Design a protein around this ligand. Structure first.
Ligand SMILES: *[C@@H]1O[C@H](CO)[C@@H](O)[C@H](O)[C@H]1NC(C)=O
Ligand SMILES: *[C@@H]1O[C@H](CO)[C@@H](O)[C@H](O)[C@H]1NC(C)=O
Ligand SMILES: *[C@@H]1O[C@H](CO)[C@@H](O)[C@H](O)[C@H]1NC(C)=O
Ligand SMILES: *[C@@H]1O[C@H](CO)[C@@H](O)[C@H](O)[C@H]1NC(C)=O
Ligand SMILES: *[C@@H]1O[C@H](CO)[C@@H](O)[C@H](O)[C@H]1NC(C)=O
Ligand SMILES: *[C@@H]1O[C@H](CO)[C@@H](O)[C@H](O)[C@H]1NC(C)=O
Ligand SMILES: *[C@@H]1O[C@H](CO)[C@@H](O)[C@H](O)[C@H]1NC(C)=O
Ligand SMILES: *[C@H]1O[C@H](CO)[C@@H](O)[C@H](O)[C@H]1NC(C)=O
Ligand SMILES: *[C@H]1O[C@H](CO)[C@@H](O)[C@H](O)[C@H]1NC(C)=O
Ligand SMILES: *[C@H]1O[C@H](CO)[C@@H](O)[C@H](O)[C@H]1NC(C)=O
Ligand SMILES: *[C@H]1O[C@H](CO)[C@@H](O)[C@H](O)[C@H]1NC(C)=O
Ligand SMILES: *[C@H]1O[C@H](CO)[C@@H](O)[C@H](O)[C@H]1NC(C)=O
Ligand SMILES: *[C@H]1O[C@H](CO)[C@@H](O)[C@H](O)[C@H]1NC(C)=O
Ligand SMILES: [Ca+2]
Ligand SMILES: [Ca+2]
Ligand SMILES: [Ca+2]
Ligand SMILES: [Ca+2]
Ligand SMILES: [Ca+2]
Ligand SMILES: [Ca+2]
Length: 220
């Protein structure tokens, strides 16, 4: 036998759908037909993409009908891109016994969306506030942000961490007011501090959590 033949794809252009993030996962498989002798290196396919955008793709070969098995190199992420036009050429392991036509496969990808958790913006060393505060007064009018611009999903603001009960939140407007009697003078307060953490949840359409710390400067 001789490497008289080159490999030929059975589709020339494919398509597949994909998800943003669990991932490193099988997108689509490809078909081809070289005509020289089967168990031979004049029959084993070798691939490669022409251009690897963020270099987030890997493709292996398989001794089945030595189909082209493409996958995800490093998860995706997005709301950044939906389209992927890339091309893969196929060779044999051993060079050709004649000039031949190299034949590519052109392929299109689409990224499905998964919706992620929201986040308070910072982790706040905010309110240098005094001990004389009136039980029920504006301390920190805060806000959190959520990724997915599909944004027709709101959330609810919940508090959480805790030495004892002073502060209070409007859950549908994230407003931290100050209820209670405080006293810079004494117990939990360690260095001039009082640190508290709170939460926020992604609803509207699925699930979410947001852990944000909050240090507030008490006064004398
Ligand atoms: C698109 O992708 C699907 C994946 O199931 C594939 O069957 C199809 O041949 C590809 N091409 C087009 C035009 O749909
Ligand atoms: C490989 O695919 C081409 C495209 O149809 C076809 O003509 C050829 O017969 C296939 N190879 C074999 C051994 O059938
Ligand atoms: C498929 O092709 C790639 C690209 O060269 C190669 O690295 C990989 O080893 C091949 N897979 C097999 C099983 O030969
Ligand atoms: C694949 O990318 C090409 C290049 O623009 C486009 O024509 C095609 O619609 C994309 N997806 C499918 C289903 O072929
Ligand atoms: C304040 O933050 C510190 C540092 O993590 C933590 O140990 C403490 O429990 C928080 N609350 C108070 C009242 O100090
Ligand atoms: C949000 O995260 C919290 C972490 O404190 C977790 O316990 C909770 O299950 C999450 N909520 C939802 C709705 O998934
Ligand atoms: C946020 O909530 C998650 C869910 O329990 C938790 O794992 C994480 O420690 C929390 N803290 C931050 C800063 O996200
Ligand atoms: C892609 O995944 C395969 C399977 O683990 C690995 O052997 C290979 O090094 C990775 N990268 C490339 C370019 O094939
Ligand atoms: C097409 O490119 C391949 C390498 O990817 C090369 O081996 C082949 O000879 C090229 N085609 C021609 C007609 O030279
Ligand atoms: C695959 O199809 C696309 C669109 O028709 C084209 O740009 C690309 O060059 C094709 N590859 C081959 C080998 O024809
Ligand atoms: C693969 O085929 C396409 C279209 O036929 C061609 O434009 C491209 O140059 C080829 N790629 C290689 C490496 O030969
Ligand atoms: C809360 O968020 C702050 C960021 O300001 C971080 O330093 C701290 O470790 C977090 N505490 C917890 C329990 O998540
Ligand atoms: C209070 O202030 C000092 C100086 O900024 C800081 O380094 C320290 O972490 C804070 N709390 C304690 C218990 O020292
Ligand atoms: Ca061949
Ligand atoms: Ca032959
Ligand atoms: Ca995303
Ligand atoms: Ca998303
Ligand atoms: Ca979300
Ligand atoms: Ca006091």
């Amino acid at each position: 036998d001789a490497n008289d033949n080159a490999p030929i794809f059975d589709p020339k252009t494919y398509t597949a759908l994909v998800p943003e993030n669990e991932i490193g996962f099988e997108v689509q498989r490809l078909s081809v037909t070289d005509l020289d002798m089967p168990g031979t290196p004049a029959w084993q396919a070798v691939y490669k993409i022409r251009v690897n955008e963020g270099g987030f793709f890997n493709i292996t070969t398989d001794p089945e009908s030595n189909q082209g098995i493409l996958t995800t190199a490093k998860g995706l992420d997005f709301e950044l891109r939906k389209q992927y036009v890339l091309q893969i050429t196929v060779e044999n392991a051993e060079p050709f016994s004649v000039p031949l036509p190299t034949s590519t496969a052109t392929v299109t990808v689409t990224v499905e969306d998964v919706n992620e958790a929201p986040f308070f913006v910072p982790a706040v060393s905010r309110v240098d506030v005094s001990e004389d505060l009136s039980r029920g007064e504006k301390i920190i009018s805060l806000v959190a942000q959520d990724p997915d611009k599909q944004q027709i999903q709101k959330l609810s603001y919940f508090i959480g961490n805790d030495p004892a009960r002073w502060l209070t939140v409007n859950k549908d407007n994230g407003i931290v007011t100050g209820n209670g009697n405080l006293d810079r003078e004494s117990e939990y307060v360690k260095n001039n501090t009082y640190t508290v953490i709170m939460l926020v949840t992604d609803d509207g359409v699925s699930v979410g959590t947001g852990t944000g710390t909050l240090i507030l400067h008490v006064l004398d």
